[PDB]
Amino acid sequence: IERGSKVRVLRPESYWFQECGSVATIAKGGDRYPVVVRFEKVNYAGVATNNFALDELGEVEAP
Amino acid sequence: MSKDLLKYLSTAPVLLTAWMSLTAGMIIEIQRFFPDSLSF
Amino acid sequence: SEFVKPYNNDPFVGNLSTPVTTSTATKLYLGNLPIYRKGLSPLLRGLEIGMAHGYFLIGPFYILGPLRNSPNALLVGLFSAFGLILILTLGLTIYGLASFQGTEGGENLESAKGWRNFTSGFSIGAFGGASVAYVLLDNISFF
Amino acid sequence: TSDVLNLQIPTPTFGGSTGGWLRAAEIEEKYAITWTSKKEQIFEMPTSGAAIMQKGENLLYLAKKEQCLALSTQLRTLFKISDYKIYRIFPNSEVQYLHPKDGVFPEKLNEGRIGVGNVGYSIGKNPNPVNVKFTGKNTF
Amino acid sequence: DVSGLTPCKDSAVFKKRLDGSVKKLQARLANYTEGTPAYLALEQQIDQTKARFAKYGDKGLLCGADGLPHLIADGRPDHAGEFVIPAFGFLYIAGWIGWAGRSYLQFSKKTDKPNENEIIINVPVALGMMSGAFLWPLAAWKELINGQLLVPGDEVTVSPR
Amino acid sequence: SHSVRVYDTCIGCTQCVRACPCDVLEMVPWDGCKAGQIASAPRAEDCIGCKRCETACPTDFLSVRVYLGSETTRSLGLTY
Amino acid sequence: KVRVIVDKDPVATSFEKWAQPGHFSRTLAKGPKTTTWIWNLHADAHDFDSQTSSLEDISRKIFSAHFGQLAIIFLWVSQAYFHGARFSNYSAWLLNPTSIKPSAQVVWPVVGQEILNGDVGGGFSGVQITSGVFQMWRASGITNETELYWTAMGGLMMSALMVFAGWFHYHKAAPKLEWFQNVESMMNHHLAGLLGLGCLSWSGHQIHISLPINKLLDAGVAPQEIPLPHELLFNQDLMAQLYPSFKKGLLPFFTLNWGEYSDFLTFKGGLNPITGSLWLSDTAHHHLALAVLFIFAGHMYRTNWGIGHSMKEILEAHKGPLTGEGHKGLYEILTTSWHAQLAINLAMMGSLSIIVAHHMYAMPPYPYIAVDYPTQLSLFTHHMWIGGFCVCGAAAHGAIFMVRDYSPVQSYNNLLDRVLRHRDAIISHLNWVCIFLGTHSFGLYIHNDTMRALGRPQDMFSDKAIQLQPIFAKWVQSLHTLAPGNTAPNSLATASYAFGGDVVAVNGKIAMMPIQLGTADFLVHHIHAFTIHVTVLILLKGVLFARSSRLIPDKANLGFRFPCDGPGRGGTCQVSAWDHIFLGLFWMYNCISVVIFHFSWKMQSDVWGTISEKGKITHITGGNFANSALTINGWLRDFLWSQASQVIQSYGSALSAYGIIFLGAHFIWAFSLMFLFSGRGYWQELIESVVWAHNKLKLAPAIQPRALSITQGRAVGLAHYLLGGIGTTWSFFLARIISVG
Amino acid sequence: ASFLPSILTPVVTLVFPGLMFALFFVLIEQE
Ligand code: CLA
Ligand code: CLA
Ligand code: CLA
Ligand code: CLA
Ligand code: CLA
Ligand SMILES: CC1=C(/C=C/C(C)=C/C=C/C(C)=C/C=C/C=C(C)/C=C/C=C(C)/C=C/C2=C(C)CCCC2(C)C)C(C)(C)CCC1
Ligand SMILES: CC1=C(/C=C/C(C)=C/C=C/C(C)=C/C=C/C=C(C)/C=C/C=C(C)/C=C/C2=C(C)CCCC2(C)C)C(C)(C)CCC1
Ligand code: SF4
Ligand code: SF4
What we know:
Chain C: It comes from Emiliania huxleyi. This is part of a larger assembly, with 8 protein chains of 8 kinds. Chain A is an all-beta fold and 63 residues long.
């Protein structure tokens, strides 16, 4: 939604579904999932980052 | 007893063993002083 | 020295040319066994194998059978051998039916006609061998 | 490259093993892997044992594409040999060139490759099984 | 009294159980001589057995046909000491424990390294949380009313239905 | 044979292909991803189903996904 | 040259890495993100080679860990001696060994456990022990409690010295890999210096302190009047009074008139009639001869001086036509890899523990230990279990060597390569042997059950229907019985009375007896062979197929312990050599369980018991083994059901602790089945539901909880299974034997 | 009658199930 913002994930299949994450990067064109949300709660694989689209995120607190 | 050794004593297993030791001792002393309490 | 080399000069086939596998004794005995002997028809292969197995099959039933300590011990042993041989030839026939479904070559154990000749040889040979061993065991006092 | 093999290359020096093909690579399908080495040197076969890859050309027979690929990974990550080619040999002696199909390893993109098995939506958007009940399709 | 059971003080089977245990202890007493540590320990033990049986008789416990105390857990205040008062005591203690744990977790989640704080406990504040959890029923009620206890579910991870 | 599929959540990090021990997967050009590449499975018949691609996939859920199905000599990985 | 070379102050002494929990590994040093981190911290704790690449550092860590372990063992010897000193009835037992039950543990009265201080004789209340330490001390010559107290203090001093040595040899002066790899000097010093001088010193101790004290005790002198060991050590007149050869001094030793010492250095054999144990003069001669043998053996390998052997050359010289290069490379393998050495050493240690179990019961070495039936059973069973565990550890570390330290450049065309090149033949043939052996050995039992249930005893594989006599074992027993005259003329008695001879008995109870071997012994011995062969099948297959297999050509890449390689190829479950060990531990558990059951029933029915004045031999179970051990029904009835009475009826008595442990071990054995049968996916989903419940309350932990890994679940199930089964057998045997014997 | 156990039990529990096993094996090994 905006870089450095806290956003709630709304993707149903996400490990972080209905949980907050910090946006680190939003890309230009191209990527169907431009936003890059960084979490602190590692999923089962171990990664704490994932790419989401703008529609799959809802801001809770701004930078 | 440097800050590092205090940190090590503050680690989870040492603290678990210490607290459960104190708890078991408390229960056992309550048993010695008020034994066979199948009631209140 | 080196008595274990590749099988047929092929290091990548899953085998080794050990003395047990590739010695002249092993080659001679195996190649001269009826199932491998050169020139024997499938009927004779089955016949030799049948008599061979039928001669020895009676023995366990005769001595260790339930009626070993009975006057009809050898009769019961022969009947048990006949039953076991019946099961074995049934197994042979169903194996031929399941394996060599579509075949017309014949004169080959890996074909339907050849395996049927082999099974007939085995069946008759094993019945005769059980009976022959019965006859010998009745008159074992001769030796 | 091409669907052909010399079928006469000198093979690695190996003392034989029990891990090789058994009455099925000659009836259904065998596999071959051919590479080139700068020095004659020792390596570990996918089948249990140790062999000596020769100087220059080397050819090996195996029973599994997995075995060939495992040997290939060994060659790449130990001896830095990255010219290997993998073939599938049928009982009718047809030879099919399989792994470096475009001449380059699959991990590096090429301009001519077309996509096979690509879905245009996220993983969590497939139809339910009840939708495809009593139909020949599947939910992917 | 209830359930066909009788008070343990007026229970012939209870008295026989006491007498039988006493006779067993006195029978094993024969091996040891007067004044030895084993003899004195057995004397203490038999005194303890008699005191235990007398205490059960005096407490008002009900003894069945088997001659053992049977605890009546139905909520009658005549037998409150069997379950109701121990039940309240445990509920208070367990609430203390859980409140200490939860409050320390709330503290640690705001720490710069919550993952390391989970293993290495900050003991100076852990003791404070443990002490302050003595008044958990009012603290939990306060958090309930202010809405800081139950996170809205619209904020908890949930598997695709 | 097993069915291998790739979804557009691919980021083109080319790790499934390296984890592949049967050369089932391969990177092909793609407009969607920033890296310009997407995994694809043109040789699904050689799939065995060890799911090393799924293990190596770093997406929150797997861009590369394998469904086990009809079995074969290759899929069973029998040397005989 | 062989030389001492060490680095000084290699590691500082600080608690900072105590505070940092997962410092040892790169991945664990980051900190936790899931609860699997916590488990991995323990799992990879002593995996030094995964932590550091340097073989020198690995060797230093191992050396100091050995020191720490020796400190623990010295503290354990100290606990035994100190408890015997203080909380025991050792003096009463020493006065009256046969009637006094040995006890060296006392519970405190808190919650009614004081009953566990049962009547153990001697005016002492306590928990009966079954470790044989009382008999050990009587053999050693300890007659007072001050000696036990002071040796306990010495053991504590040695434990402190060992902790200091472990700290010093890692933090102040750590050796180098050049020092560690001096295998020749290590063998020389361990043979001549450790074993040889240990045996020599023990022989001296026996000859000077144990023979006189034990002879006087057997004569009848009470412990108070016994002259003290320091008096005996130098009083040559008293030692001449007891053993006349001592008056000749050491001249008959220095001159080769060794026959003068025949009185206190003997080859009598058999068992002492008084104590019903081995002659201590025989034991002294034994240890002296072994000291000489080991000192002779320890001068074989090369050192700074020109003489000696090189194990490299010895190995390289052994190569045959069917073996190619032969043993080439094995010296380098065993000098470079610690896991190979660990594998060999664990295998030999376990086999030695089993051999110890077999030898001690047949030749009771300590006085009044044969009559102490709980001690014999406990020691035999314990050493059997330790042996099985050590053997499986050997297999595991062989697999670890194969996965990690194997290299074809080194091991090309040697025995290891040639073994790997026909592993398929090896495992297939062992598979056939296992099927054949199990089919015959167990189907004989099943046949016996079938015919008994069909009411056909004449068709049994019994001693009177169809006999399967162990003719070869009977022949060997006869040869051993006739040995003392013909093939061992200087021996005055058989090595063990189990083979044959007289019935040794102390008081009424029987110390040793000839053990007959019949159809039941044949059947159970072939059962033992079947179980051993299946265990070897599992373990050897795990070791051989650790590198790769027809299913996974690249199994070495995945690692030593890994869960699987996916559901592909129809399923690649438990392909790892670790999982092979996990399965082989069940099988050695079954093997040792059947072995100890055979031991218990056979000794209770045919050996242990009582003999009256006339000679009425009455056994504990009454010789029912020979006729009831032919069926699994008989095994279930006359051994488990029959002997479980003393366990189950133990409530309200001193063995009620054994009853409680019986139940608890049953519970843990069953609890293990949860982990053994279930899988991580269900448990992770259940944890997800619980985590939702916690997150709803704002208390989901920062360290996210996860179900245990697959390998960890298998390990936990195996550990609980082994603990439950072993504890069940432990409580059952101890309660039964203490109650009846 | 008391004849029939002897006639029927072995016919039905050795011959028929053996033939059924043979038939099932032969059928499942078709094509
Ligand atoms: C399912 C029912 C049932 C069961 C469990 C049995 C069991 C038995 N019968 Mg049988 N029997 C049955 C029904 C059944 N019978 C019926 C209805 C009749 C006709 C009135 C008979 C007539 C009969 C005779 C005359 C004799 C037996 C005997 C026996 C015994 C030997 C087996 C044998 O060869 O019998 C089978 C014999 C037959 C002639 C075939 C009967 C066919 C039945 C009805 C088939 C039912 C199939 C079932 C519902 C499902 C499929 C089973 C399977 C394919 C999975 C055995 C205890 C023998 C005996 O007494 O031994 C001590 C004997 O001599 N039975
Ligand atoms: C911090 C403490 C804490 C708190 C407040 C809760 C709270 C809860 N747990 Mg529990 N739980 C805890 C720790 C805690 N858990 C731990 C460490 C584990 C792992 C063993 C579990 C495993 C667990 C499971 C598997 C389940 C619950 C359930 C529940 C719920 C019902 C209460 C119950 O039956 O507890 C049960 C309690 C236990 C099984 C053992 C608790 C362990 C100890 C005794 C307490 C920990 C105290 C901690 C060390 C304090 C440190 C603070 C200090 C530094 C100041 C509730 C949401 C159930 C649920 O979902 O119900 C809706 C449920 O199914 N919990
Ligand atoms: C390592 C094992 C060991 C040890 C330590 C000993 C020790 C002893 N044996 Mg030997 N012995 C052994 C094995 C051993 N033996 C074996 C295996 C055999 C069987 C072959 C024998 C057979 C044997 C016999 C048959 C005899 C001995 C005897 C002796 C004494 C010899 C004294 C001597 O030579 O002084 C050596 C002296 C020196 C090296 C010079 C230094 C002297 C120092 C400074 C003196 C210190 C004295 C002390 C600390 C204080 C004592 C004071 C006193 C008032 C209490 C001594 C007690 C004799 C004895 O006394 O028997 C009871 C004897 O007759 N032994
Ligand atoms: C000389 C003996 C010896 C030595 C030096 C080693 C050394 C090693 N083993 Mg081990 N091992 C041994 C014997 C030995 N082993 C035996 C006898 C077995 C057979 C069971 C094994 C089986 C084995 C396996 C299968 C593996 C190892 C591994 C290892 C390495 C890491 C172990 C670790 O960090 O554990 C740290 C310690 C623990 C995790 C604690 C273990 C606790 C156990 C399971 C339960 C204890 C129960 C207790 C006694 C009773 C409880 C009572 C109850 C009432 C409370 C290390 C090199 C691992 C390795 O090399 O991986 C690459 C590995 O995978 N070992
Ligand atoms: C009682 C339980 C049981 C049984 C019967 C078996 C059986 C077997 N296990 Mg074991 N196993 C067990 C528990 C058991 N296991 C458990 C709990 C585990 C988990 C730890 C394992 C793990 C395990 C492994 C990992 C391995 C084995 C192996 C084996 C085989 C040993 C060879 C053998 O003796 O076969 C012979 C068969 C028997 C002893 C059973 C009885 C046979 C008699 C003669 C009856 C015959 C009946 C008749 C002919 C047919 C039916 C009649 C009618 C209905 C038609 C065999 C299949 C090893 C193997 O592969 O061996 C080659 C092996 O590698 N097992
Ligand atoms: C190699 C060897 C071996 C083995 C051996 C064997 C295995 C043997 C066998 C043997 C035998 C096993 C023999 C047999 C014989 C036979 C016989 C003697 C037969 C006869 C038959 C007959 C006479 C028939 C006839 C008939 C009839 C009656 C009817 C019609 C048809 C017919 C014509 C067929 C051993 C290890 C020892 C040693 C080393 C070497
Ligand atoms: C002379 C004689 C004889 C014969 C004998 C024989 C025939 C023998 C054989 C023998 C043999 C046949 C032997 C063998 C041996 C072996 C060994 C000794 C082995 C060892 C091994 C090892 C040491 C290993 C180790 C390891 C492991 C375990 C794991 C990992 C890897 C390694 C390698 C490290 C008779 C009887 C006639 C009598 C007269 C005389
Ligand atoms: S998400 Fe998976 S398929 Fe896509 S690039 Fe990464 S590893 Fe390859
Ligand atoms: S259950 Fe375990 S062993 Fe079986 S396929 Fe799944 S991960 Fe592999």
